[PDB]
Each structure stands twice: as structure tokens, then as C-alpha cells.
Design an enzyme around this catalytic site. Structure first.
Site, PDB file in Angstrom:
ATOM      1  N   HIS A 110      12.174   3.847   1.423  1.00 13.62           N
ATOM      2  CA  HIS A 110      11.510   3.165   0.324  1.00 13.62           C
ATOM      3  C   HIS A 110      11.432   4.115  -0.861  1.00 13.62           C
ATOM      4  O   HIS A 110      11.689   5.315  -0.740  1.00 13.62           O
ATOM      5  CB  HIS A 110      10.112   2.686   0.728  1.00 13.62           C
ATOM      6  CG  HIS A 110       9.210   3.791   1.180  1.00 13.62           C
ATOM      7  ND1 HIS A 110       9.153   4.215   2.490  1.00 13.62           N
ATOM      8  CD2 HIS A 110       8.346   4.574   0.493  1.00 13.62           C
ATOM      9  CE1 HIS A 110       8.286   5.206   2.592  1.00 13.62           C
ATOM     10  NE2 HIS A 110       7.782   5.443   1.394  1.00 13.62           N
ATOM     11  N   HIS A 116      12.017   8.058  -0.179  1.00 13.13           N
ATOM     12  CA  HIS A 116      11.429   8.496   1.084  1.00 13.13           C
ATOM     13  C   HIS A 116      12.220   7.900   2.240  1.00 13.13           C
ATOM     14  O   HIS A 116      12.112   6.702   2.520  1.00 13.13           O
ATOM     15  CB  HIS A 116       9.959   8.092   1.175  1.00 13.13           C
ATOM     16  CG  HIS A 116       9.047   8.958   0.368  1.00 13.13           C
ATOM     17  ND1 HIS A 116       7.713   8.664   0.183  1.00 13.13           N
ATOM     18  CD2 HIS A 116       9.275  10.112  -0.300  1.00 13.13           C
ATOM     19  CE1 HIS A 116       7.159   9.601  -0.566  1.00 13.13           C
ATOM     20  NE2 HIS A 116       8.085  10.491  -0.873  1.00 13.13           N
ATOM     21  N   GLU A 164       5.743  11.017  -5.996  1.00 11.44           N
ATOM     22  CA  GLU A 164       4.496  11.391  -5.343  1.00 11.44           C
ATOM     23  C   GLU A 164       4.352  12.907  -5.276  1.00 11.44           C
ATOM     24  O   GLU A 164       3.314  13.456  -5.660  1.00 11.44           O
ATOM     25  CB  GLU A 164       4.428  10.760  -3.951  1.00 11.44           C
ATOM     26  CG  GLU A 164       4.328   9.241  -3.993  1.00 11.44           C
ATOM     27  CD  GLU A 164       3.947   8.635  -2.659  1.00 11.44           C
ATOM     28  OE1 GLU A 164       4.524   9.046  -1.634  1.00 11.44           O
ATOM     29  OE2 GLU A 164       3.063   7.752  -2.635  1.00 11.44           O
ATOM     30  N   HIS A 224       9.125   5.308  -4.495  1.00 12.49           N
ATOM     31  CA  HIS A 224       7.902   5.325  -5.288  1.00 12.49           C
ATOM     32  C   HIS A 224       8.300   5.587  -6.732  1.00 12.49           C
ATOM     33  O   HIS A 224       8.948   6.598  -7.020  1.00 12.49           O
ATOM     34  CB  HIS A 224       6.929   6.400  -4.798  1.00 12.49           C
ATOM     35  CG  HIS A 224       6.523   6.245  -3.367  1.00 12.49           C
ATOM     36  ND1 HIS A 224       5.400   5.544  -2.983  1.00 12.49           N
ATOM     37  CD2 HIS A 224       7.087   6.706  -2.226  1.00 12.49           C
ATOM     38  CE1 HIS A 224       5.292   5.577  -1.667  1.00 12.49           C
ATOM     39  NE2 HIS A 224       6.303   6.276  -1.183  1.00 12.49           N
ATOM     40  N   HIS A 229       3.682  -3.372  -1.523  1.00 11.55           N
ATOM     41  CA  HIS A 229       3.435  -2.021  -2.015  1.00 11.55           C
ATOM     42  C   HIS A 229       4.696  -1.345  -2.523  1.00 11.55           C
ATOM     43  O   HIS A 229       4.640  -0.597  -3.502  1.00 11.55           O
ATOM     44  CB  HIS A 229       2.807  -1.158  -0.910  1.00 11.55           C
ATOM     45  CG  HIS A 229       1.777  -1.875  -0.094  1.00 11.55           C
ATOM     46  ND1 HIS A 229       0.501  -2.122  -0.555  1.00 11.55           N
ATOM     47  CD2 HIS A 229       1.834  -2.399   1.153  1.00 11.55           C
ATOM     48  CE1 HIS A 229      -0.182  -2.769   0.373  1.00 11.55           C
ATOM     49  NE2 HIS A 229       0.604  -2.949   1.419  1.00 11.55           N
ATOM     50  N   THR A 281       0.695   6.574   2.254  1.00 12.87           N
ATOM     51  CA  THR A 281       0.060   5.269   2.188  1.00 12.87           C
ATOM     52  C   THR A 281      -0.788   5.055   3.435  1.00 12.87           C
ATOM     53  O   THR A 281      -0.562   5.701   4.465  1.00 12.87           O
ATOM     54  CB  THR A 281       1.104   4.148   2.073  1.00 12.87           C
ATOM     55  OG1 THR A 281       1.976   4.183   3.209  1.00 12.87           O
ATOM     56  CG2 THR A 281       1.926   4.316   0.813  1.00 12.87           C
TER      57      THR A 281
HETATM   58 ZN   LIG Z   1       6.685   6.987   0.682  1.00  9.80          ZN
END
Ligand SMILES: [Zn+2]
EC number: 4.2.1.1
Length: 257
Positions: free
Chosen positions: A91, A116, A103, A93, A61, A196
């Protein structure tokens, strides 16, 4: 079998995770004009001096860089938080284009990428126990806009070629997460969830107002990763972000005027 496609994307998550339609879901659109300036918010304490990274992992992911969280080595204090939060992993995005990927949005503005930094409250013992408490997690969201290159990010970018497919991992020691922070620590805060699955509503979100600048060559190597595993048809790991959720009965607070 959740993902970011057409038949398993965020619009299909509520069928296996009915909390996706919950009250404190993340991300949300940060309306800077309705955000209430809270003068009782303390300055953020970002203590990343003794941070000890271990491994970078492609989990199908995104990619996580995992930290040693068995001691108080890289902690986040102050702000809206009561107690100490240990940095476990971070991580990103990102999107297939530079006009999307974040996000969270700032007045509907989509950033190219979002970092994040995930932390868990020390008063719950471990991460598996902290995700089951409303004040268990605290994620330090940081936007990324495409501009001049970010030096402190270059070590992460150069190692992505060794974790192309899902399940691949590689040693990633002596990485300083301080090189990923902007100059200012002004932030918005609100109670939310994991963006998630399992989408657990346990996260105290802290979104920094100032973004960081990264080059197009840095974000173009994010897009060379693959959702799939090795030996499978190639599916580029792009647009791994969840769209905004309804704010509902929540007020976003700010640490700045
Ligand atoms: Zn995240």
C-alpha cells in the site's frame, strides 16, 4: 472508527489503542548521522520473480494490492531478517501536497509518498499469527519523490478509477512489484510497529535509502480516491500518513557507509 481526520486522526488513536504510546512505535525520523553502520548486515534478498497479485482494494484508509501468499512466491530474505518473509500486500501513504505524505522522514525531510511492501514470517503459518510475534512482520518502506514518471507504477494508477470509494475492489493480476524498486537496495533497519491500528509492535522495518521518482500526474490520481463509501459525501483520500514517533530506546542501523 479511526481515520486521518481532525477528530479521529493519529492524535486520537491512543484512546482506543493504548499501544500507540508504546516503545517500538512507527514511523520514526531516520537521523542519517546517528544511524549506526552495521557491517554484519547481509544484502537484501528481494525475490519477486514469481509474484502473483490477485486484487486491489480500497479499504477506506489506503488501497491494498493483495498477493497470493499461500506459497513461497514473492519472498524477502537476507538483511537483518532470520528466515523467509512472504509478500502479502502493499500500500501507499501520500499527502495532499508534494512536500508531505511519507510516514518515515530522512532528517525531517518529508517525501511526497511512501510505499509499504508488507511481508510476514513464514515460521508462524499465516498473517494473523505473525502479527502477534515481535519478529513476525517485515515491511519494505520505499519513498516517492515527484519527478519523472515511474513506468512500473502506471498499471496501479490507471486502475484507481475503478476503486474510488471504500469497499470497492477490482481484479489486479499479473502485476510485477519489481517495477516499484529503486536501483540501490541500501537500507536502514530498526524494530517498530504497524503505522495504522491496531498498531501492533511486531514489524522489522527496512527503509531503502534511495527513493523512486513518480510524476505529478501519477500522484494526482492517488488524491482522487475517497475515504468515504459510495453514496456518501466525498472526502478525498489525502494525508493518510502517521507523523513520526519518538525513537525512545532504539538504534537505527544502516547497511551502507
Ligand atoms: Zn503503511
Amino acid at each position: 472508527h479511526w481515520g486521518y481526520g481532525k477528530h479521529n486522526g493519529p492524535e486520537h488513536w491512543h484512546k482506543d489503542f493504548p499501544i500507540a504510546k508504546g516503545e517500538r512505535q512507527s514511523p520514526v525520523d531516520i537521523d542519517t548521522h546517528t544511524a549506526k553502520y552495521d557491517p554484519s548486515l547481509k544484502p537484501l534478498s528481494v525475490s519477486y520473480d514469481q509474484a502473483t497479485s490477485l486484487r486491489i482494494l480500497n479499504n477506506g484508509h489506503a488501497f491494498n494490492v493483495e498477493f497470493d501468499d499461500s506459497q513461497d512466491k514473492a519472498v524477502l530474505k537476507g538483511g537483518p531478517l532470520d528466515g523467509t518473509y512472504r509478500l502479502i500486500q502493499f500500500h501507499f501513504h501520500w499527502g495532499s501536497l508534494d512536500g508531505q505524505g511519507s510516514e518515515h522522514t530522512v532528517d525531517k525531510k518529508k517525501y511526497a509518498a511512501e510505499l509499504h511492501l508488507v511481508h510476514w514470517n513464514t515460521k508462524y503459518g499465516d498473517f494473523g499469527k505473525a502479527v502477534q510475534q515481535p519478529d513476525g512482520l517485515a515491511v519494505l518502506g520505499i519513498f516517492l519523490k515527484v519527478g519523472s514518471a515511474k513506468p512500473g507504477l502506471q498499471k496501479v494508477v490507471d486502475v484507481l478509477d475503478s476503486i474510488k470509494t471504500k469497499g470497492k475492489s477490482a481484479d489486479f493480476t499479473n502485476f510485477d512489484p519489481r517495477g516499484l524498486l529503486p536501483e540501490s537496495l541500501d537500507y536502514w533497519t530498526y524494530p517498530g510497529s504497524l503505522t495504522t491500528p491496531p498498531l501492533l509492535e511486531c514489524v522489522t522495518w527496512i527503509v531503502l535509502k534511495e527513493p523512486i521518482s513518480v510524476s505529478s500526474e501519477q500522484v494526482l490520481k492517488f488524491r482522487k480516491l475517497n475515504f468515504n463509501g459510495e453514496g456518501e459525501p466525498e472526502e478525498l483520500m489525502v494525508d493518510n500518513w502517521r507523523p513520526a514517533q519518538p525513537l525512545k530506546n532504539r538504534q537505527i542501523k544502516a547497511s551502507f557507509k
